[PDB]
Design a protein around this ligand. Structure first.
Ligand code: NDP
Ligand code: SF4
Ligand code: SF4
Ligand code: ZN
Lengths: 48, 287, 208, 126, 96, 111, 376, 176, 114, 95
């Protein structure tokens, strides 16, 4: 999360490779986030 | 017998009928019209596809909500075929390719496929198994295709006694092979008798046999109501279409009647001639 | 009383009462009921043989202009010899008042087709023909709008049930979209909710 | 303009579009709806409801729902008298049954009768 | 923005509306969430000791509509309403 | 004036005398209409008072202050329309008593 | 595709690059709205009035809730009236900016559509913070507004007001002073006042062609009588003139939002009646009668006294009318909708009697159609 | 108050007519339009790189249709059928039986995700707050078979997360 | 009982207008089977047209016959225009069964058809 | 607590598991049946029997306005524990 960027480009997620053994270096999906960071990432709060 | 198998009221569109039908092939032509008439009847249809899911995606939505079901299969093993006949009331063998490929000739489709599925069908407890074949496919000459279908008829007659061996003549429709081959050529003519029968008469007969008991074991053969000359037929096709190699031996050689075994009216469905439906279906001429 | 109760103004009530008795004085040939609700809008209940005279009067005459037309719906009340009700809903431009001409009719006898005097009435009339079935004599154009061309039944009656008799699906046997009788996936479970104990006391009809 | 008018029947059933199967095959039932007996109030009375006799309701095998091929089995009309009910049933074509109204009978009760001397009408508990 | 002077000068020169001020990339009024728990007040209800519901019984006050004539020299002809006054050109920059 | 506020309403060059002969035609055609009907009396009252509004003023702005129908020709157009309904109402005889009664179990609501 | 902007099956019979006549065959978007509301209750069939016009997401809710309140004899509380007025003005702003931008995309004019849709995305975010829905926020129950706004919203609307005044003045910079766009819509769309009053036109046509008329000024159905604004009037009955009418109504909606925020009272959310509005959660979980009224209010539906009513609001299309017919029950007996889009589509021949096909595209573009409302 | 538009006149002065003539013959206002569009060119566009930057929301969104359960306990529903009574497309279907204890419970609890129109009436209506409109909106389903949720689907969808749901409810139980 | 009928005065105008409408349908069908590129012979279409006339044969009232003339006139106008499509003309026919006969035996095996 | 069915399919918390004459088995082909893994019956014995010494006590459910409405249960049975209908957890009295 940066504070020099605006509302929408605040927070972003970078996924790792083979998080469930599925060769996810490519083709990143939605809902590859755990739900607490899913609360954090939609700007539903101001706390990690 | 068990509940959710008994019929319910009217027919079609989640009006549940009795049969649970496992249909082989069906990505081609006759299986597609048969799946359509079962969805009009409204039953649960298990179709295995080895092919792309996209072809069965385009022939998919004819079933109602969760009615048809998909699985995968091959012509090598028995595990996927047993998975196809885990629970199946009736099952039909509609398989075949009209030209030899690398991995499969005319041999071993007609030999290798019905052996395994007839074996596992007699084992795994199905009823009223229906096998198609071609008309007048004998041990006689000029067709490796037709002698291989005679070999397959021998096997399906020998093992699994309680079948329905059935055979139509050359059938014509919207995605016909040989009638489109007649329209898409380039050409010569002899004297050769031939009876064609429209495809929905055949599939009405098939579904009437698939829901009718106590006519089983009797093999059937289908009858064209005209049964006239090949060269007159090519003239009529070119006339309605406005324009002036194992397959070509099969179409030139012979198509005869066989009075030994029953046909359409012994089952009770009206035959429709070539000319009416040919005016109906011969689009795609000039302009 | 004073909070959270929408207060009425008796000025509009008295003025519309005087205007209603005035209309009943000056057109005695067709007037049956002139009723005023608590929220002060005029309702004039009329026989269906003076539609053209009443509208040709109420468009002009300089005591009430009423140029503007709106809703026409022939609200289907059964248990009557005349089922349907044509409701013209007229609005002034100088005076800020709303009048509802409720004229009655049945399923078959035509009303006089107001399109000659109110030009807005054309598609309103075509809609009422296509949904109800009130024919409009001496009218130029009666076609079907809001329903299918191969469709019949006048679906906004009470006698047309909520589902349809026809339902479309595609089939490849004839390569087209064909119509079949209805085979639903779920019942539309209708819940009885006419609860007793008479939730309004002032509207008790006289019993026998 | 002093037109034809003659006293005959009405045959809207050829206009309303509903097919002959539902014209001849079902049977209307017209009745005053009885009180839902657990509650005690008669606002749900004082009408004349018309219903249709139900038909087959099978089980949807995918969810256990009730799929029905019955378009008319969920219509119910509210009328004000029996004669308009009969007139509408003959006008709109189909057959009908008349289950006649059965009002509650008036009776006579008094607490002084509940506390009699030789008569056996006695509550014996209150 | 957050950039150099030449391109910001070309932005102001292509439209002189002070582009750096109101630029539609907000950084500051992102609303500070996890607010304190708000108490929702209630006005002229739930006050004890006088709230007879029969007093403010607004549903029951709907009278059936009053009926004037049926089928079952008086100096008159008023309108349904007074004639509505002609308006005025507003002061807030009219035309013309 | 010059180019009034409406669209399909071109300005008038003779307000007064055109409207005066209009209202004399209104009273004339109303004079053909029978007597005991209320319609003759109310039309007579409103038309004579509107004409006496006009005959007492040679103005335009004070005419708009005193008489409604803003601005000017709308009174003329509504006058022509009331003349049109008068010409219709020589026919149709609306003061005659009622055409036949309702079936009397109809207009009362609660069904 | 696009020259319907949706679906209208146009049948134009024409002598060449001209006309003879035309019929808009409409009703392809028929959905059975009045029938479905006839088989439902009031509170359950509220979303049909949310989406029979599918753009004005709050105005038609306001119209239905005012019909129920007008029949039911309940004044809504003051703060609910002010929130309803604020979102009426926001909804008017959204609907007029969609009308201008879809006129532009129908006529060509790619990018100003996109500038103003980024602004409309901001306003969708505000609706989401209020209710949760992207577009079809129900949110306006009968008897005042339900589930009032969370803490921290008015400052955001203030910031949007400043940014949006600058952006709409840059849209006037872009489009209004254009040569060929003016040449594109001046010659067409004459509307005589006779035609405007007989053919049943409503709203922006009546403003843009002659007659001084506004429901907000004439018959204030709520607290509109306490703010300073002034509706634009047309000059010649022209689509350039009507475009100017729509842009200045956007500007006056900005002024009404500004004055409404600077005169906002913090009263209360819903009515003082637990027989129409549901009791809230605290008294629900700790009362008895609140749980009773919650349970029967959501199962049975509140009863509505018998009677026939009609009302109309000033939706951004025009005189949006709703006509209720209530048997004494908890289900409305018959509802019907006066659609300004339908009455405007009725005058299609008289607007385009002597013109060509691109003029017909401009005639459909210059009147805010949704055709979900032309159907009913 | 009325403020009409388009009432000017062309001033026949030499200055005004030569300004309008320069406007005509010199393409000035078209260059002005190009200037406005390039003034929006040299800005920074407000896009978001989607699968890395999800969009903003509210704490009162309507998504997933989860169920809840008591703290260290069993299910929170009762089968009180209010949600089937208030579902405005009647997608809710509840068949209820009591189990071997005696406390009332269910057998079958169905939402049609096709017919669900995402009001929140079953969010406002449920007295124990058993059904909650879930937080996330990613359904993206291949077949029509999957979109008919069961009760065990909703329990395993409420077991997939509650910390989100509990945090949002504790954020916003005071308004609704 | 005051009734003002639509067009006729007795059934003589009813017979006149219905024979005119049948003449219109008889000469309008081969144009449509040329235009819509159908699959049906001309005499089969004409026979089902006269079948649709014969279906409503048991109607006596003049108003109902006049209203049927109105309905048929409206649909003949919408078929001589090209406003309808191949779906609608095939919807008038029946080439999608609906196979259930009127036998009591078949209505006994197929459930619950009295 | 799944049951070793002859089919081998997982049972549910409700006794709805199939037979050998069911084709809904063959519509479960290749698609793994999602059953609830944490049941609802056995999660009562996991919770201890609370002991509140008073006679008629009050149950809310873990916090105000998050849970079930106030239910005032009685404990007068000498051998049967109390049971809130909403909660499901028991109560006993302490003399
Ligand atoms: N006149 C006629 O057309 C006659 C037809 N028949 C029978 O009718 C049926 C349909 O006719 P037609 O169109 O010519 O045949 P098709 O090829 O269209 O139908 C056979 C289907 O089974 C598939 N299939 C066949 N062999 C194999 C294999 N070894 N492995 C995997 N898939 C296989 C085919 O291709 P894919 O694998 O790509 O799905 C196709 O889906 C056939 O069974 C044919 O024997 C019989 C007599 C006359
Ligand atoms: S409203 Fe809540 S408690 Fe009632 S049945 Fe629905 S989910 Fe269960
Ligand atoms: S949100 Fe969905 S499940 Fe809930 S009431 Fe609305 S349509 Fe029904
Ligand atoms: Zn408890």
């Amino acid at each position: 999360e940066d504070n020099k960027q605006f509302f929408g480009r605040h927070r972003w997620v970078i996924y790792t490779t083979e998080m469930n053994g599925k060769n996810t270096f490519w083709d990143v999906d939605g809902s590859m986030v755990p739900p607490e960071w899913h609360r954090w990432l939609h700007c539903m709060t101001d706390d990690p | 017998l068990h509940h959710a198998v008994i019929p319910h009221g009217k027919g079609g569109r989640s009006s549940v009928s009795g049969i649970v039908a496992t249909v082989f092939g069906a990505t081609g032509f006759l299986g597609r019209y048969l799946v359509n008439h079962l969805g009009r009847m409204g039953s649960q249809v298990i179709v295995p596809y080895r092919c792309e899911p996209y072809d069965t995606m385009h022939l998919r939505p004819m079933g109602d909500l969760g009615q048809i079901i998909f699985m995968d299969w091959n012509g090598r093993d028995k595990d996927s075929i047993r998975r196809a006949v885990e629970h199946s009331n009736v099952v039909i063998n509609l398989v075949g390719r009209e030209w030899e490929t690398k991995n499969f000739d005319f041999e071993d489709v007609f030999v290798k496929i019905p052996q395994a599925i007839a074996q596992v069908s007699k084992e795994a407890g199905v009823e009223k198994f229906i096998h198609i074949s071609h008309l007048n496919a004998d041990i006689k000459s000029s067709s490796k295709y037709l002698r291989n279908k005679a070999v397959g008829e021998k096997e399906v007659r020998e093992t699994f006694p309680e079948a329905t061996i059935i055979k139509p003549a050359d059938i014509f429709g919207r995605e016909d092979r040989f009638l489109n081959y007649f329209a898409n050529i380039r050409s010569l003519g002899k004297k050769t008798v031939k009876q064609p029968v429209y495809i929905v008469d055949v599939t009405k007969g098939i579904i009437n046999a698939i829901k009718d008991p106590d006519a089983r074991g009797k093999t059937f053969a289908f009858v064209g109501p005209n049964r006239y000359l090949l060269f007159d037929l090519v003239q009529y096709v070119f006339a309605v279409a406005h324009r002036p190699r194992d397959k070509v031996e099969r179409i030139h050689t012979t198509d005869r009647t066989l009075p030994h075994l029953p046909g359409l009216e012994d089952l009770g469905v009206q035959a429709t001639p070539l000319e009416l439906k040919a005016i109906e279906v011969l689009r795609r001429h000039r302009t | 009383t004073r909070p959270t109760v929408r207060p009425r103004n008796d000025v509009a009530h008295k003025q519309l009462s005087a205007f209603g008795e005035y209309v009943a004085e000056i057109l005695p040939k067709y007037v049956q009921q002139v009723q005023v609700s608590c929220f002060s809008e005029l309702e004039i209940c009329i026989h269906p043989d003076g539609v053209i005279p009443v509208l040709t009067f109420l468009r002009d005459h300089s005591n009430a202009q009423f140029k503007s037309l709106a809703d026409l719906t022939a609200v289907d009340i059964p248990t009557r010899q005349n089922r349907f009700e044509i409701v013209y809903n007229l609005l002034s431009l100088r005076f800020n008042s709303r009048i509802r001409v409720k004229t009655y009719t049945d399923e078959l006898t035509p009303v006089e087709s107001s399109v000659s005097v109110y030009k807005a009435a054309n598609w309103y009339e075509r809609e009422i023909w296509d949904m109800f079935g009130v024919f409009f004599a001496n009218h130029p154009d009666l076609r079907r709008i809001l329903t299918d061309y191969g469709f019949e039944g006048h679906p906004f009656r009470k006698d047309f049930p909520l589902s349809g008799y026809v339902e479309l699906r595609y089939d490849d046997e004839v390569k087209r979209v064909v119509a079949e009788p209805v085979e639903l996936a779920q019942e539309f479970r209708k819940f009885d909710l006419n609860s007793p104990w008479e939730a309004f006391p002032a509207y008790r009809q006289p019993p026998e | 303009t002093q037109l034809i008018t003659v006293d005959e029947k009405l045959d809207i059933t050829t206009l309303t579009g509903v097919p002959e199967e539902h014209i001849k095959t079902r049977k209307a039932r017209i009745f005053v709806p009885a009180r839902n007996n657990m509650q005690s109030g008669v606002n749900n009375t004082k009408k004349w409801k018309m219903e249709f006799d139900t038909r087959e309701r099978w089980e949807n095998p995918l969810m256990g729902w009730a799929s029905t091929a019955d378009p008319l089995s969920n219509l119910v009309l509210t009328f004000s008298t029996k004669e308009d009910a009969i007139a509408f049933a003959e006008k709109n074509g189909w057959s009908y049954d008349v289950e006649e109204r059965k009002v509650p009978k008036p009776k006579s009760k008094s607490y002084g009768a509940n506390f009699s001397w030789n008569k056996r009408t006695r509550v014996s508990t209150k | 923005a957050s950039a150099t002077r030449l391109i910001q000068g070309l932005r102001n020169w292509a439209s002189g509306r002070d582009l750096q001020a109101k630029l539609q990339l907000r950084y500051q009024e992102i609303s500070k969430r996890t607010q304190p728990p708000p108490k929702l007040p209630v006005g002229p209800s739930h006050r004890l000791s006088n709230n007879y519901y029969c007093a403010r019984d607004g549903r029951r006050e709907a009278m059936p509509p009053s009926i004037v004539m049926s089928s079952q020299s008086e100096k008159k002809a008023v309108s349904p309403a007074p004639p509505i006054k002609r308006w005025e050109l507003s002061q807030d920059e009219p035309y013309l | 004036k010059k180019t009034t506020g409406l669209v399909g309403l071109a300005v008038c060059e003779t307000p007064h005398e055109r409207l005066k002969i209009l209202y004399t035609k209104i009273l004339d055609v109303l004079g053909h209409i029978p007597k005991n009907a209320a319609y003759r009396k109310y039309t007579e009252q409103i038309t004579n008072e509107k004409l006496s509004i006009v005959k007492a003023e040679p103005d335009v702005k004070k005419l708009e202050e005193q008489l409604q129908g803003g601005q000017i020709e709308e009174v003329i157009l509504q006058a022509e329309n009331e003349l049109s309904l008068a010409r219709k109402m020589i026919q149709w005889k609306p003061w005659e008593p009622l055409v036949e009664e309702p079936p009397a179990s109809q207009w009362k609501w609660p069904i | 595709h696009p020259a319907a902007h949706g679906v209208l099956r146009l049948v134009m019979e024409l002598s060449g690059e001209m006309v003879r006549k035309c019929d808009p065959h409409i009703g392809l978007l028929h959905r059975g709205t009045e029938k479905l509301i006839e088989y439902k209750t009031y509170l359950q069939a509220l979303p049909y009035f949310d989406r029979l016009d599918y753009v004005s997401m709050m105005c038609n809710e306001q119209a239905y809730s005012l019909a129920v309140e007008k029949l039911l004899n309940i004044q809504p509380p003051p703060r609910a009236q002010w929130i309803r007025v604020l979102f009426g003005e926001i909804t008017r702003l959204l609907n007029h900016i969609m009308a201008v931008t879809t006129h532009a995309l129908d006529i060509g004019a790619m990018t100003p559509f996109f500038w103003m849709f980024e602004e409309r995305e901001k306003m969708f975010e505000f609706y989401e913070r209020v209710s949760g829905a992207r577009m079809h926020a129900a949110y306006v129950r009968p008897g005042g507004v339900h589930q009032d706004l969370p803490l921290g919203l008015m400052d955001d609307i203030y910031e949007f007001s400043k940014n949006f005044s600058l952006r709409i003045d840059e849209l006037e910079e872009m489009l209004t002073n254009n040569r060929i766009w003016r040449n594109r819509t001046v010659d067409i769309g004459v509307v005589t006042a006779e035609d405007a009053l007989n053919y049943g036109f409503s709203g922006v046509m009546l403003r843009g062609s002659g007659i001084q008329w506004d429901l907000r000024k004439t018959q204030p159905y709520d607290v509109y009588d306490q703010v300073e604004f002034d509706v634009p009037i047309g000059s010649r009955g022209d689509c350039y003139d009507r475009y100017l009418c729509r842009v200045e109504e956007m500007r006056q909606s900005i002024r009404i939002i500004s004055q409404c925020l600077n005169k906002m009272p913090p009263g209360e959310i819903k009515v003082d009646d637990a027989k129409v509005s549901p009791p809230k959660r605290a008294e629900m979980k700790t009362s008895m009668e609140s749980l009773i009224h919650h349970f029967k209010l959501y199962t049975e539906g509140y009863q509505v006294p018998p009677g026939a009513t009609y009302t109309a609001i000033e939706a951004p299309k025009g005189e949006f009318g709703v006509y209720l017919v209530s048997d004494g029950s908890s289900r409305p007996y018959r509802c019907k909708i006066k659609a300004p889009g339908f009455a405007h589509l009725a005058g299609l021949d008289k607007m385009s009697k002597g013109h060509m096909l691109a003029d017909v595209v401009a005639i459909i573009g210059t009147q805010d159609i949704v055709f979900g409302e032309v159907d009913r | 108050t009325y403020k009409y538009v388009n009432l000017r006149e062309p001033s026949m002065d030499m200055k005004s007519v030569t300004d309008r003539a320069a406007q005509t013959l010199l393409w000035t206002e078209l260059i002005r339009g190009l200037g406005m569009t390039l003034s929006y060119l040299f800005r920074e566009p407000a896009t978001i790189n989607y699968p890395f930057e999800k969009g903003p929301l509210s704490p009162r969104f309507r998504g997933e249709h989860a169920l809840r359960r008591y703290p260290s306990g069993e299910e929170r529903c009762i089968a009180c059928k209010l949600c089937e009574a208030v579902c405005p497309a009647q997608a809710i279907t509840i068949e209820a039986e009591p189990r071997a204890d005696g406390s009332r419970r269910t057998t079958r609890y169905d939402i049609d995700m096709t017919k669900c129109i995402y009001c929140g009436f079953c969010q406002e209506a449920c007295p124990v707050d058993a059904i909650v409109e879930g937080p996330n909106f990613e359904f993206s389903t291949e077949t029509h078979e999957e979109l008919l949720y069961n009760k065990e689907k909703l329990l395993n969808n409420g077991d997939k997360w509650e910390a989100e749901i509990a945090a949002n409810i504790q954020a916003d139980y005071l308004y609704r | 009982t005051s009734v003002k009928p639509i067009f006729s005065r007795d059934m003589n105008e009813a017979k006149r207008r219905v024979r005119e409408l049948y003449r219109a349908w008889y000469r309008e069908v081969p144009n449509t089977v040329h235009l819509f590129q159908l699959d049906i012979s001309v005499k089969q279409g004409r026979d089902k047209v006269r079948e649709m006339f014969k279906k409503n044969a048991h109607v006596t009232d003049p108003r109902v016959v006049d209203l049927l003339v109105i309905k048929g006139k409206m649909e003949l106008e919408e078929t001589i225009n090209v406003w309808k499509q191949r779906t609608h003309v095939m919807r008038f026919f029946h080439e999608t069964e609906a196979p259930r006969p009127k036998d009591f035996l078949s209505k006994f095996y197929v459930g619950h058809d009295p | 607590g799944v049951r070793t069915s002859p089919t081998g399919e997982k049972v549910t918390h409700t006794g709805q598991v199939y037979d050998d004459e069911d084709y809904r088995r063959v519509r479960f082909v290749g698609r793994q049946k999602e059953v609830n893994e944490n049941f609802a019956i056995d999660l009562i014995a996991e919770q201890p029997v609370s002991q509140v010494g008073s006679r008629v006590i009050s149950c809310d459910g873990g916090g105000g306005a998050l849970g079930h409405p106030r239910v005032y249960i009685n404990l007068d049975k000498e051998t049967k524990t109390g049971t809130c209908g909403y909660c499901g957890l028991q109560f006993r009295q302490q003399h």
